[PDB]
């Protein structure tokens, strides 16, 4: 015993859940995977197409191409089920419908785009289902009752369209009144609607099976190879004997105007050929499948011809009774006419609030429902191919079979069971889609995702959409005005296809780009599956209509970008400013949840500009050289400290910030400026070195200016601060670039005709040292210079040579033998590193280093040079600075470099 | 006297310019707008289509639809000229070709996408132009010389294709050898090629004019309304009298097999109708334009019928001599066949290195060239409509006119002038495109934008592309294998259309999004123009072929995203990490060049977390409340200071940073963490408050915890620091949120059943105070509470009421009259503000504020409360803290708020 429903859950349920945040009522509706996602998805996938148009599709396509159609459609919907299940497992499943899951998983932008595309899909589905109920009622149930009587022969077809427009509008107003007053009854009878569907399908299968031994007696009159309609004919014989008199039969009256055979003038085809009774449903074992295994695709108005029976060759006798192809078919038309029979998988998660284990019921339930419906469709394709005549199939309005539903002829009890089950099922699906479209519309309105839809957020006392439903009815009316399933189906399919394409693309993107909170806990979901689904039914969209597809893509893109703009203006306060703000924040967040290191090391600079007492940059060359080093790409944070109290220097801080920004723009530096007003310059710099940049956009190198004239100045703070900064950089594990004689560094406008960047590779930290000159040579200033590596001190050397080879930029390496004592400070530091994982000697060896370095590189344009670490005791800081100063004595332009990190 | 060229400038020139950075040789090639951009664009727009296919297009389309075609094509190319001129004016114009301008203006990603799409365009253009030269040579000049002789009747069509494949491949190998050896000769004779084009067009116009009084004698034999071919017939008469004997004419031999009229069996149409000589070129004043003003669009193999002459009605006599429609035409086919006649506008800026005033010559020159060619095409459409028979036009191979070029019949001297001018012009355009395609390819390779194309960067001694040209020849070969202009033209047009679509879309985007360095200094460029162009010829792309267009879009999208990925990996060092890094940097940069303020104010928080001596967050509730306030969206920077020396606390800093990150993730705070190891907690906080965040992603509110137990602690630093931070926030012009009793703030899991957020709006800073509660109520925790504004102190009040109404969230405002003395500290501060633009009294009035505030709001869940500024003298800091403490004495949870900024 159960009272379940297949409808959706809109804002009313999501709100109930959110309020229930802070139960016995909830526990009772809890439903297992079967009755919670299998049956809702099954009842919503089985639409009207399977009946009113599957026989026609099989016939006009040939079992092979019909199999291809059903398989392609089922493939898009299955890959979308896998992607939607990936969405279902990821994170908590909201209590609302599938829209809320998709929204909370893909962000409001995709949520709103998918919501509106799926909503237009559902409205045009209410239109197609009402058209189908009207077509079944009007063509098969009560043909006599029509608003417009059949007039002449040319207009009779138009009269049917008018009959459908008027009847469909009346029926749509009825369905809207029903959903508005008494949707509870729809919930109550969803089970009866599913019963009708399943009884109908079992009747189809029972008929197909019974058709093996005892097939039914539905014969078709056929004149030669020209199929005749049997709506008015009684006997498939030229002369109908009456009262022992061979009076001519009515068909004579329909091909000959005498009607008394008194020297009757019968047309050509009638006199030559013969009328025959062809069994319309041969046995399943009869083997007709071999006959109808091939496409027909006859254009509009062509007579339907069985290519089996005999025939004369005369032509010209065009007649009304000849059953005609009612639409110019094609493959791309058949896929569109058939696709709205696989839509409805989002209904699998339309009942997610009333579930027990959502992430477990929804994926399995949805995929099993799609497997069931795909098997039903792919099996019925073959059964129709192998049980129905290849001519009764192409009859799209049950002509030639006395006006019975084509699939109806295959049933155990009678075609009536199917002709009524399809009518009740199709009106039930119409009611379902007139409840599912406005609930989704009020959920998109209540989310305030899109502003102008705010009017439709208004709900009834019970939380029913009063003003969303009216718009849904208006759009369904616009649909019904095209009173033909064959023309509404491409539009419906295009909207649902856009919904499925976005659901597959958002998943593929969020899996590739490592979007935060994208944890698809599914045992079989791989982004290639969602991508293959997106591709399959992008192709499906375009195949069915290349102009409708572009219109849908542009509509969805505009809704998406407009939702993004409104979200920006909502959270940041401005439209485009806030849009870029959100882009930056989202990129940085995505940047956080990832491996901290990078497979390659690239210097992201923090230029430490020193501000004089006039608050002017004491070294613009720092910026010039930073621009040359980064070449306008990458991250360059220009930091500077203003000594003083912040409470009274805010104006100065703003002025100096504008100054530094103008200087950066003048030196073609693309980057950011940050000023810290600090009480102590050393502490200000120690805070800039470790705090610049938003998390994930940190620097990794600190570019400093050498403290020129340290000995001359009486104050010892200037030289002692540089060492303090060096220690801070080393402790923070950042690279260090101490530029010396920076006043002589070349400007952005001048160039070097010829020169040598003399990188000195010493025992360790070879990665940064080698990488620098090439980044410099990539700039126009240092473009025309050569590179010479004067190595002083096996496996690492070989690795370096290989890395240079990969670099592909010409560089010559020379190894100069040096006494260990001369390089003692280096070897000492290296030993300290290996174990981790004097002054007179240091100076007397630094002068040897001077001898070699000047003798080899005196005339270089830029001498890179590895650094030794600062002393452990801060007492030998003077000795350390003297060591550096002598080590660099006599060189024109030195870039002291210290790795101090895992640089690769 | 001048020796100019119309070719492009590749890497060789761009490199020369860059080297010349640091002249007499350059000055001599300087060329004015006319000979620099007008004539190159004019010589490259006038292709083969105008001749070999314009007459056919006019005929098979009708002057009206042909006018529509030419106008739509010219409209896309004109809007693209406007967008390309906007690119040309913006910034310095590089010396290379149009590729370099487009690259430096739209970034390397669009540069490479446009480069490759335009390159495939140019290669398939070399294929079409070689096919055209072969078709002209083979069909009109020397029909007798063909590799394959006519095969039967129907096959003869296939034989022509083989004749074209073999001749075209031979000609393509010739053109490749010519461009490889002696491109200088191509530069020398570009002027002769332009001469041929212009002489040909003036000959067309002179013929059209001469056709007013004296039209030429090109008659056409027509049998009834069936046009006959005249390649073999001599007299348009059934019987050709020979030697005074009325012997039957050859056409008798082509419709009757007797050939001697001895009881000849002539077919039906021949015996009934009559052969007539219809003047093929009636006068311009004859008025035939009224006849050919309508489309024909006859499908393949249909006989071309003049709907003017008399005719019998018998049918069946299918014959070889009946001129047939050679391709199943349609509008969408004609637009594709005609579009490669408007392409070539990027050649306007193919000579930008040798210009005087680039930003002035290129826009005017290009637009004038497009106006000239559009006028020539739109004028020739009408002239062909009004001068050529409506049957000679639909003849696509000069049949029925004795095998002469259709447009050739309209010329002053003879059709020979045009038939040779078109051949020389088309081989010249083939040479041009086999020099323009490989130059562009080596420029895309040398830029190292795309890695795998690196092989093609290899150049000859002079800087000619040795290995790019071979690939261009291979792709042109693949094109020639489809030996028909009518089938190569859609592919060429699709590639060039993709190039133009990207050139229009990049401009529209960079204008809307305010991309840095996008200064379009043009007097008429508006992004709506570029957008309209993008839309027009996106429609053109899809119209011509919906599957080729998707293939082109996907190819261009993949090249674009792959270039973006390679740039990320190049500059940042990682692929996806670096990709997000570049996205963030670009967003922040774009964010810098904009108005600093925002039309709306939204709190971007800096949570100041206090770290205890155990290095644990002393107040997680700060984070919880920050999460509730921002609701997971926006910017939240969690800053904290570790007291100590950074040189030895790096490990602790990393540990505490991980701790704070885990806490943030536990409290659902999405944001970033920054630790500053400082010598003094107060100075560390003063540096965090002013330095957090990358420029443009700054905070604007500082969220602090109240210094609980300030009086109990003997140390006065704890209470004095809070005031110092308040002063720093106020001076920095940031908002301030002092949370008091923060240990009692509700957690993210619990909720409030019912409660009142009692915002106290006091004299000023009403914007932040009102905005806060609504952001709080937007969270599930504070969702179920109400809001009560207890205003204490006209126009501003009305503005506040209106703002509350806009907010749309229910709130009740109560104004309580209070004595000015009680609010003295507030009124005093307000007066200080108005002028800019005791303690016993303060305490005795704070207790009155206590009386009122507790009597009204004692049981509130959260009391917001405006703050007075800190005292000017730092001596009264104890009095200020006592004032605050009493003012908040007895309230459960207080959020002291201070605006101190231009909050709106
Ligand atoms: C149903 O019967 C009609 C009556 O003959 C068929 O019409 C004619 O069918 C032939 C195929 O048998 C069509 O092609 C013809 O083929 C012969 C084979 O040699 C060829 O000699 C003819 O020139 C022609 O190509 C023919 O077009 C068609 N119509 C006429 C006016 O003859 C009809 O095809 C039959 N239906 C099916 C499905 O076969
Ligand atoms: C060139 O001459 C031929 C020879 O008659 C034309 O063929 C026939 O042209 C008529 C139009 O006059 C086509 O339509 C017919 O119209 C009459 C008008 O009453 C109608 O009674 C017929 O039933 C038919 O609809 C006809 O299809 C066409 N072919 C045959 C076999 O008759 C041809 O149209 C002429 N070309 C042009 C451009 O007019
Ligand atoms: C029509 O029927 C007669 C006798 O039943 C038969 O002889 C004739 O061949 C038939 N014609 C065709 C086209 O089958
Ligand atoms: C053919 O020509 C004869 C005499 O010139 C004329 O009488 C007849 O009407 C013509 N037939 C047609 C169809 O014009």
Residue numbers in the entry:
A (entry chain A), B (entry chain B): 102 to 123, 126 to 896, 903 to 946, 1028 to 1094
Question: Would you copy out the relevant sentences from the publication that reported this structure?
Answer:
Potassium‐coupled chloride transporters (KCCs) play crucial roles in regulating cell volume and intracellular chloride concentration. They are characteristically inhibited under isotonic conditions via phospho‐regulatory sites located within the cytoplasmic termini. Decreased inhibitory phosphorylation in response to hypotonic cell swelling stimulates transport activity, and dysfunction of this regulatory process has been associated with various human diseases. Here, we present cryo‐EM structures of human KCC3b and KCC1, revealing structural determinants for phospho‐regulation in both N‐ and C‐termini.
To understand the structural basis of phospho‐regulation in potassium‐coupled chloride transporters, we used single‐particle cryo‐electron microscopy to study the full‐length wild‐type KCC3b transporter and mutants of this transporter in which two canonical threonines (T940 and T997) and a third KCC3‐specific phosphorylation site (S45), which was shown to play a role for full activation in response to swelling (Melo et␣al, 2013), were replaced. Unfortunately, the bias towards top views was even worse for mutant KCC3b‐PKO and prevented 3D reconstruction beyond 6.5 Å. However, we achieved a map resolution of 3.2 Å for the phospho‐inhibited KCC3b‐PM variant. A unique feature observed in the phospho‐mimetic KCC3b‐PM structure is the presence of pronounced density for a short stretch of the otherwise unstructured N‐terminus, a domain that has not been resolved in any of the previously published CCC structures. Electrostatic surface representations of KCC3b in absence or presence of the N‐terminus illustrate that this segment is wedged between CTD and TMD and partially inserted into the inward‐open vestibule created by the helical arrangement of TM2, TM7 and the helices TM1a and TM6b of the transporter core domain. The direct contact with the ion coordinating helices TM1a and TM6b results in a visible obstruction of the ion access path from the intracellular side, suggesting that this domain arrangement could play a role in controlling transport activity. By contrast, no densities for ATP or ADP are visible in the map of KCC3b‐PM, which could be the result of small sequence differences in KCC3b.
